[PDB]
Design an enzyme around this catalytic site. Structure first.
Site, mmCIF file in Angstrom:
data_model
loop_
_atom_site.group_PDB
_atom_site.id
_atom_site.type_symbol
_atom_site.label_atom_id
_atom_site.label_comp_id
_atom_site.label_asym_id
_atom_site.label_seq_id
_atom_site.Cartn_x
_atom_site.Cartn_y
_atom_site.Cartn_z
ATOM 1 N N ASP A 64 1.262 5.313 1.590
ATOM 2 C CA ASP A 64 0.749 6.274 2.568
ATOM 3 C C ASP A 64 1.271 7.689 2.284
ATOM 4 O O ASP A 64 2.467 7.895 2.118
ATOM 5 C CB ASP A 64 1.173 5.868 3.973
ATOM 6 C CG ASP A 64 0.661 4.484 4.363
ATOM 7 O OD1 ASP A 64 -0.532 4.183 4.114
ATOM 8 O OD2 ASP A 64 1.473 3.702 4.899
ATOM 9 N N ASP B 173 -3.552 5.312 1.688
ATOM 10 C CA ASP B 173 -4.111 6.092 2.794
ATOM 11 C C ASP B 173 -3.613 7.514 2.688
ATOM 12 O O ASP B 173 -2.407 7.759 2.463
ATOM 13 C CB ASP B 173 -3.650 5.530 4.149
ATOM 14 C CG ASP B 173 -4.459 4.328 4.593
ATOM 15 O OD1 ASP B 173 -4.167 3.818 5.693
ATOM 16 O OD2 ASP B 173 -5.410 3.938 3.887
ATOM 17 N N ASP C 90 0.861 -1.178 0.000
ATOM 18 C CA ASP C 90 0.000 0.000 0.000
ATOM 19 C C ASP C 90 0.901 1.234 0.000
ATOM 20 O O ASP C 90 2.129 1.125 0.040
ATOM 21 C CB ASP C 90 -0.894 0.008 1.238
ATOM 22 C CG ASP C 90 -0.113 -0.245 2.520
ATOM 23 O OD1 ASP C 90 1.068 0.179 2.610
ATOM 24 O OD2 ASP C 90 -0.686 -0.879 3.429
#
Ligand SMILES: [Cl-]
Ligand code: NA
Length: 335
Positions: free
Chosen positions: A196, A259, A194
């Site tokens: 961030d 995120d 992922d």
């Protein structure tokens, strides 16, 4: 001589003991799946020590004098050196319990507690989950919809493309606002699972209401498959958006977990430090702060619960200095 705290030693991105550390980390992960936090920590600490070693371990004599190497971790390394394989690790890899917990916990919005409950309720596969959608949160449903893409490693070039669209959106919404890549990619990783980004503005308060404007822009450009916005109340007390981006590629596209977190500039050094990781580095850094200095360190600040006082940091460097630690750049925090 090898310091006992991971935050008191540099741990580079690449090292000489990946086979041994990977094996110990399988046992660590398995222990966490069974709720044994103590055993998880023990295996993680042993593995981390090997990552800091400047040479490959080729004989068991090299474990002598190293911290965090008790009997169990030592036998694991011994068996790998002597036989090329560790029977206990191989049993874990082949176990339905481990395979299922790994499968479920990898899904967006699923942690150990949920995965364990699902396992106990007889769920084993992704299709089992899709067959019981009443059991799923919206995050989990989105995680299942995109799970193939979301299990595909994210490349540094993907991250670059994503950072460009986020920066464009932020810049158009609020000139002067900044976007900082954090997480493993800031620590120099070339792949990850992922992405961030931490967003702030140099004038405290100018960032209020920025995040929804950014998401509106990105959504309008077709870049968003899933968005969950959450107001402020370990990054949970910051305003944040949990996203799945639709990343265009030539003749195709790929879902990517991103995120976005907004921090007021006063708390930015603490948020950056916290969210830069690694998970073990920060855990140990917080343990160090508490045990050695009697201070509580989190992603918002550094607090003395007895004096009721906070530390005003301007940078990550300030935080290390205040704790009496030599500064480690993000690429040396790969513990
Ligand atoms: Cl990590
Ligand atoms: Na997950």
């Amino acid at each position: 001589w090898m310091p006992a705290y991971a935050c008191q030693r540099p741990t580079p991105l690449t090292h000489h003991n990946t086979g041994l550390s990977e094996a110990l980390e399988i046992l660590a992960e398995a222990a966490g799946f069974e709720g044994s936090e103590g055993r998880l920590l023990t295996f993680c600490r042993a593995a981390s020590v090997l990552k800091a070693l400047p040479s490959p371990v080729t004989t068991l004599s090299q474990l002598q004098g190293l911290p965090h190497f008790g009997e169990h971790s030592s036998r694991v390394v011994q068996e790998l050196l002597e036989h090329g394989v560790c029977e206990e690790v191989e049993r874990v890899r082949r176990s339905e319990r481990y395979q299922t917990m790994k499968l479920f916990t990898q899904i967006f919005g699923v942690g150990v507690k949920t995965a364990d409950r699902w396992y106990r309720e007889g769920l084993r596969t992704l299709d089992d989950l899709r067959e019981q959608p009443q059991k799923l949160t919206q995050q989990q449903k989105a995680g299942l919809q995109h799970h193939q893409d979301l299990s595909t490693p994210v490349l540094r070039s993907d991250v670059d493309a994503l950072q460009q669209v986020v920066e464009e959106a932020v810049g158009q919404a609020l000139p002067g606002a900044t976007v900082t890549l954090t997480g493993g990619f800031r620590r120099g990783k070339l792949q990850g699972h992922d992405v961030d980004f931490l967003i702030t503005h140099p004038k405290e308060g100018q960032e209020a209401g920025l995040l929804p404007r950014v998401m509106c822009r990105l959504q309008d450009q077709g870049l968003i498959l899933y968005h969950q916005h959450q107001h402020s109340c370990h990054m949970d007390a910051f305003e944040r958006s949990f996203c799945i981006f639709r990343l265009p590629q030539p003749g195709s596209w790929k879902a990517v977990r991103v995120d976005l977190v907004v921090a007021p500039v006063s708390q930015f050094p603490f948020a950056l430090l916290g969210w830069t990781g690694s998970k073990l580095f920060q855990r140990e850094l917080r343990r160090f702060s508490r045990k050695e200095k009697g201070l509580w360190l989190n992603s918002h600040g550094l607090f003395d619960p007895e004096q009721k006082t906070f530390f005003q940091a301007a940078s990550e460097e300030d935080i290390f200095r205040h704790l009496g630690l030599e500064y480690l750049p993000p690429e040396q925090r790969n513990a």
